[PDB]
């Protein structure tokens, strides 16, 4: 018989200084933080893809309703939410002929097919960036289904250096040109016209059309320079960092690459949220621990970035990771850390099998419920029933994060509150919240793109080039 504490829901800062808990309920009521004048959209693909994208873009401008608006707030139209124009009259179209699509798509090797076809899609974007006088905010790459299906590492044809994945390769080959692009699937925008067996859609978007419009609009607004929202209760000079280890695969020897994300608040009360890139490499197979030199370089770069943005050194530095730091790592970290800076290394995992079932209800346990095992270990339910939207973030019984303060000493309640607050900064989607801290998720997103290529030297820090 043990007691669960409850952590109050964090709030995000929308326009007019107003606060809210749901991004959809704050954007529809108050608006985005900063305003831009419009989105000049570039499109690449076949004329059918351009037609589909134009149809969706004209469809977005009107309000779209869901089956139940309480769980799914309606989309009031792009202009009525983001106060900027995203029309089909600003589209700059580039044609990829279906003849040239089928010239590379039927190569026997997946690697060569994906490389050639990514290059075909990429050259036009680069040429229109350098050799054309238009100004394009976001490049919307509409990708058919045949390309998408046969552009995976394990994909095979139906009996007649870089990664084999189309998306990661595509995003990695633009990193030296800093072009924010959004990859779309024709089924995403034209789900009604795509059927499999009996005239029914493969993807049933009928009940969730408003949510799809919300997610697409938020992603496009963020990619074009917008600031849809920001955290309100972010603390003082304490800065958060998040590390993720990835397998570089058969690029150059079995290697592991560590990529980071960083988050804090500047003197202007805004939110700084970027990545630490140039992945730090451990050559030992199966070893997800950074060597002392690599860890020293990583912490030095993070502290230098913080001091350049702020003007002094952070009071406290939190380091989220999915692994456990050994003592050599922390010795290397402390040899760079100044005296006034206090380091906490927190490990977040989602593999401990603890499910809490409500005794009588048909719904699941509340989100934000925490079970402090002890002063250095706790369980947090970042996925659970939300009274506001009256539906849990997961259909089944949710699994909680096991948050353990691996290194250093700090208040576990403050760690839990900071993690729950960090779960609200997912600019890649328009949701209430997600079950993972956004630092680790965005570090994973950065790493999956960085490890897809070998020619990257100085990757950009902004997330719109990766997400």
């Amino acid at each position: 018989m043990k007691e669960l504490i409850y952590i109050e829901e964090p709030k995000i800062l929308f326009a007019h200084g107003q606060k809210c808990t749901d991004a959809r309920d704050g954007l529809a009521l108050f608006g985005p933080l900063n305003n831009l004048y419009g989105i000049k959209s570039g499109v690449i693909g076949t004329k059918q893809g351009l037609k589909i994208f134009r149809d969706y873009l004209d469809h977005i401008q009107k309000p779209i309703y869901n089956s139940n608006s309480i769980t799914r707030p309606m989309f009031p139209g792009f202009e009525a939410v983001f106060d900027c124009k995203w029309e089909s009259t600003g589209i700059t179209f580039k044609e990829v002929t279906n003849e040239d699509i089928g010239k590379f798509l039927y190569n026997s090797s997946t690697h060569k097919r994906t490389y050639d076809l990514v290059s075909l899609f990429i050259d036009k974007i680069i040429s229109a960036n350098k050799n054309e006088d238009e100004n394009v905010d976001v490049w919307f790459v509409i990708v058919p289904d045949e390309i998408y299906k046969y552009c995976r590492p394990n994909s095979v044809l139906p009996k007649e250096n870089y990664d084999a994945q189309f998306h990661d390769q595509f995003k990695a080959r633009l990193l030296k040109h800093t072009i924010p692009t959004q990859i779309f699937r024709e089924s995403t925008l034209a789900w009604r016209d795509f059927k499999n067996a009996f005239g029914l859609p493969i993807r049933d978007f009928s009940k969730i059309e408003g949510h799809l419009a919300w997610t697409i609009s938020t992603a496009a607004f963020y990619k074009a320079g917008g600031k849809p929202w920001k955290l309100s209760d972010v603390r003082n000079g304490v800065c958060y960092l998040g590390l993720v280890y990835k397998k570089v695969e058969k690029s150059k020897n079995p290697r592991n690459a560590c990529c980071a994300a960083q988050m804090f608040l500047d003197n202007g009360d805004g939110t700084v949220f970027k990545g630490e890139v140039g992945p730090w490499y451990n050559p030992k197979n199966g070893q997800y621990h950074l060597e002392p030199k690599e860890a020293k370089a990583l912490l030095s770069q993070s502290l230098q970035s913080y001091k350049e943005q702020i003007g002094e050194y952070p009071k406290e530095v939190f380091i989220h990771a999915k692994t456990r730091f050994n003592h050599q790592e922390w010795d290397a970290f402390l040899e760079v850390t100044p005296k006034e800076t206090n380091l906490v290394g927190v490990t977040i995992s989602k593999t401990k099998p603890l499910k809490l079932y409500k005794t009588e209800g048909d719904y699941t346990i509340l989100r934000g419920n925490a079970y402090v095992v002890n002063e250095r270990s706790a369980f947090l339910w970042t996925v659970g029933y939300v009274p506001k939207i009256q539906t849990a973030l997961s259909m089944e019984v949710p699994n909680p994060l096991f948050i353990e303060i691996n290194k250093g000493e700090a208040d576990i309640k403050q760690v839990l509150k900071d993690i729950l607050s960090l779960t609200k900064l997912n600019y890649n989607a328009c949701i209430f919240a997600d079950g993972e801290p956004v630092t680790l998720r965005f570090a994973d997103k950065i790493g999956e793109i960085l490890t897809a290529s070998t020619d990257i030297k100085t990757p950009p820090l902004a997330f719109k080039y990766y997400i």
């Binding site: 809210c20 707030p73 603890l354 809490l356 079932y357 209800g361 719904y363 509340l366």
Partner: protein, 413 residues
């Protein structure tokens, strides 16, 4: 008289006034504002006076630091007070406190006796208060679905939890009893000490040379006849309470290694007991699961919970998985699975179709069904009224009731 009049400092309160006016128009209220409805090339003061006198039913005042002592705002307030006196309506003028820098003691004499609506903390809460007051006062409004959606969105934006006691059922089975001592049997050769160390009738393991057992040496006489002639020493004999409390030490064996060996022994005993119970076994990538057959229950309705069923033409069965652990306290984590068999005693070779069937079946179960099935399976596994035992003569006791959790917050469906 349907108009709603909003007074403000014209170039300083533009943002809030426009926001509030557009919102109020959104829910079907007719609003008159000088920044949206005042015509060009018109006598604006006469028009404002005529609107206040003959058109407005409510008078909302944007009370801020700029509009506190603005002459036009004061003239509008005076005319509104005269109209309110004529109308015999006490709630005609409704100030809206939107500025924090304006103290509640520095307000002007015109609204010093009226209670404002707090917009400083939250604009949406202030709008909720305005809408509640309007509904109470029955302000005229002509609406259809969009207005209701916006009204519900404004009213439901502040929904939160209530202070209610809640009880949750977990999947952790707490271990109640432990063997008195941990026995290290120096068996020496003992005919390779039964090098299989996995087909023995009791859980056994070799740390350096001593078999780690909670039982006696003569309990292994059948599998190891040499242990019949082995001198009964079984030295060290660490008491379980001391080792489990992190007190045992010294270079013979580390504390963490001792705990890991205890966990291994518990897992081996759990597997042996489960195989003793005659339960069907399923091999997985990271663990093993146990599921009953169709004829194990009559008729698969233990405590009216059901453990076997038909999806379309295949027979789904609930399956259990156990994992003994010591952190934070000695417990057994229990995991749930669903396994599909085409016939009475068979299995489906393709793991892909098995996974697809499991995902299709688990989409319509919910926490109540999951918990009831888990509790029924555990209670079936229980050999007694309130506990079941794992055989180490020595034995350990684990309760059949999963440990509860308590919370001070909940919701109201």
């Amino acid at each position: 008289r349907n108009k709603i009049f909003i007074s403000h400092a014209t170039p300083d309160d533009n943002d809030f006034t426009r926001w509030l006016a557009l919102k109020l128009i959104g829910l079907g209220y007719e609003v008159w504002c000088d920044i949206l409805f005042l015509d060009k090339g018109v006598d604006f003061w006469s028009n404002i006076e005529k609107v206040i006198r003959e058109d407005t039913c409510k008078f909302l005042l944007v009370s801020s630091s700029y509009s506190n002592q603005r002459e036009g705002v004061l003239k509008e307030l005076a005319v509104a007070a005269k109209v309110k006196k004529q109308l015999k309506d006490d709630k005609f003028i409704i100030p809206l406190a939107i500025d924090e820098q304006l103290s509640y003691d520095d307000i002007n004499i015109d609204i010093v006796r009226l209670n404002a609506i707090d917009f400083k903390m939250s604009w949406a809460r202030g709008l909720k208060d305005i809408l509640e007051a309007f509904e109470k006062q029955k302000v005229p409004k002509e609406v259809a679905s969009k207005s209701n959606l916006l009204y519900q969105q404004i009213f439901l934006h502040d929904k939160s939890v209530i202070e209610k006691e809640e009880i949750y059922d977990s999947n952790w089975l707490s271990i109640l009893s432990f063997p008195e001592e941990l026995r290290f049997h120096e068996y020496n050769w003992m005919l390779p000490k039964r090098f299989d160390v996995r087909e023995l009738t009791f859980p056994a393991v070799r740390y350096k040379n001593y078999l780690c057992t909670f039982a006696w040496a003569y309990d292994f006489t059948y599998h190891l006849p040499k242990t019949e002639t082995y001198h009964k020493s079984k030295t060290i004999r660490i008491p379980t309470e001391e080792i489990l409390s992190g007190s045992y030490d010294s270079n013979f064996i580390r504390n963490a290694e001792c705990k890991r060996l205890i966990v291994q022994l518990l897992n081996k005993a759990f597997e042996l007991r489960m195989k003793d119970k005659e339960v069907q076994e399923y091999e997985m990538s990271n663990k093993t699961a146990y599921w009953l057959e169709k004829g194990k229950l009559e008729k698969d309705k233990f405590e009216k919970t059901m453990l076997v069923g038909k999806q379309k033409d295949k027979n789904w069965h609930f399956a259990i998985s156990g994992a003994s652990k010591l952190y934070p306290f000695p417990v057994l984590m229990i995991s749930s699975h669903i396994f599909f068999t085409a016939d009475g005693k068979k299995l489906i070779d393709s793991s892909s179709v098995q996974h697809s069937s499991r995902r299709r079946q688990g989409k319509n179960w919910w926490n109540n069904t999951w918990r009831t099935k888990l509790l029924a399976f555990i209670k079936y596994l229980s050999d007694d009224d309130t506990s079941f035992y794992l055989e180490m003569e020595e034995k350990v006791f684990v309760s059949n009731e999963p440990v509860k959790f308590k919370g001070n917050v909940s919701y109201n469906i």
